[PDB]
Amino acid sequence: STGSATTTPIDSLDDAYITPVQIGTPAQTLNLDFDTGSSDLWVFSSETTASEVDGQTIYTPSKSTTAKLLSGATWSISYGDGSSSSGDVYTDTVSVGGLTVTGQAVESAKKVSSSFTEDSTIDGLLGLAFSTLNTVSPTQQKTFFDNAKASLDSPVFTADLGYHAPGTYNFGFIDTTAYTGSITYTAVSTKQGFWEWTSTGYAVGSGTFKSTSIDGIADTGTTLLYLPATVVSAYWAQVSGAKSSSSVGGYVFPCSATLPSFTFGVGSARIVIPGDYIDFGPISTGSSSCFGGIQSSAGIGINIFGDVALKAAFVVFNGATTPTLGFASK
Template sequence: MLSPLPDLNIGSASAIPQANDVEYLTPVQIGTPPQTVMLDFDTGSSDLWVFTTQTPQQQSQGHQLYNPDSSSTASQVANAEFQIQYGDGSGASGTVFRDVVTVGGVSVQDQAVEGATMVTGSFTEDQATSGLLGLAMDSINQVTDGGTTPNPQKTFFSNAMGNLAMPLFTANLKQGTTGNYNFGFVDESEFTGSVNFVAVNSSQGFWQFAASGFAVGQGAATALPHQAIADTGTTLMLMPDEAVEAYYQQIPSAQNSQQQGGVVFNCNDTIPSFTAVISGYQAVVPGDIIKFAPVTGDSTETSELCFGGIQSNSGLGFAIYGDIFLKAQFTVFDGGNMRIGFAAKSDGNF
């Protein structure tokens, strides 16, 4: 399983954290000659969209832009448009091009590149990013013909998969430092022990899997069967209320803050680990990672209050295992076998 075939594509690209690890950005080359933009790789959506020279200036100021007119391999797709809205209410819409896209040395010809003609305010404010690169299933791509008939486009990974040495990619996100996404191979130096695989249910278009329970700190595991998705594009770990309440009962100062929109606690409290039980594997998220971000100061060391990295999924039909979880695990997205694998980081290297 871990031996790539010779003479086929592999690639590796950096995943660079932004402030408080709110997102991870990866350099992507689009067009001929290549134009480099920084994109947020998102295993919870399936659209590759970018700020372009056609994005209104008041929305795109300060962003690195893709200019299709400067690419000899770019072509606009007639009648095609996209409109996407994410779970936090942000979104983008616009037109569709085809162009060559390269990630970490792996290239795809005629990749659908969606050019934003409208983005919501949070994307405008986030000047470090030039858009998203979706890595979920093709079925939830948001391209339509003329705004009515769905015309889902293949993701970068879907297009690349057949030419990769192994039909998978891996995520090794790190806390406060640069990690990586690897395509077509599994780097055994990035994890310890074995990779623990569980089947993926792709019916809703996500990297969705079954989890069986959880544990807090050194406590015994509690059975809580639930569906979950592995989502690099979500910052936090969003869990069923039963797990959230059980976790924060172990932090005396924890309180639900309407002002902050979630559970906060005293930064100098002892923060226990959280363990997700997945097909018998115990995926441990250290308390230091769950101490997500300062509320009242510049850092979790100087702030009185910290915002918790585990929050309620607000009754959503599945949990979202976002970056808080994925920072603590080496993760294999195996598209060829429709499964996902988790392993402990080498030397606790979060």
């Protein structure tokens, strides 16, 4: 089997992407944030504290003839940005782009933090990291991909995120029309439960490539590119007036600037992030200070190849017995 679904930016900045997901019988379609940095499929629901729901579409398990309470199971998750959610668990039928999993754990939120409430466009998350990170207790649950894998034509999914445009998540096949040149594959460590890999270096604009190993995670659920302070300083030094602002929470730059590109290495291959992808616009409405899309990972504890990086590539998440990651230009 295979599946193919369009993923759409939630706003004009590509802050996140939403993908429609069918849950239950008859189908209830919710728009979920596919997150290769976590491993829980959770939704706003009829159980979510009413004051914490503001415009989201909810899953109502009592209206699904295939929903079953997973008795005794609870979940609770905290994300790198400080947001969180928790609740109980149902199993139900879940379909993405025509690919159906029966008995998928659907984690129903009883509580969500303010950032989730305030984002009316995201109805929940669909985790695509390794199932070892799943938070359900006392019986850990599998991700949608893990459940689908054996049925797929090939044990892979691909992320093809757009810049200010829709893109695609495919399951079970590689669309050879969706990228240019060849796909370069690179090793993955699953030790921390992430799609963790090592970039071979970087360049700033038309500058020379610096060969250096940068360990990080491919994370579709993180907006920006978080890299070591040395690398980030070298990038922003090429933008007149750019500076790190403790008050704003990162590097800012004059909105009048033209940003240089940023290149990262994948083995001997190179992925070029155009300068425009690194512009996250005014820090506040009407400001002439703009927020940068490359930020320091210092104090996160891990480097993160978030959407800024991933949307410059066609990315293969290869879930074979020994997982790997592939990157192609597009």
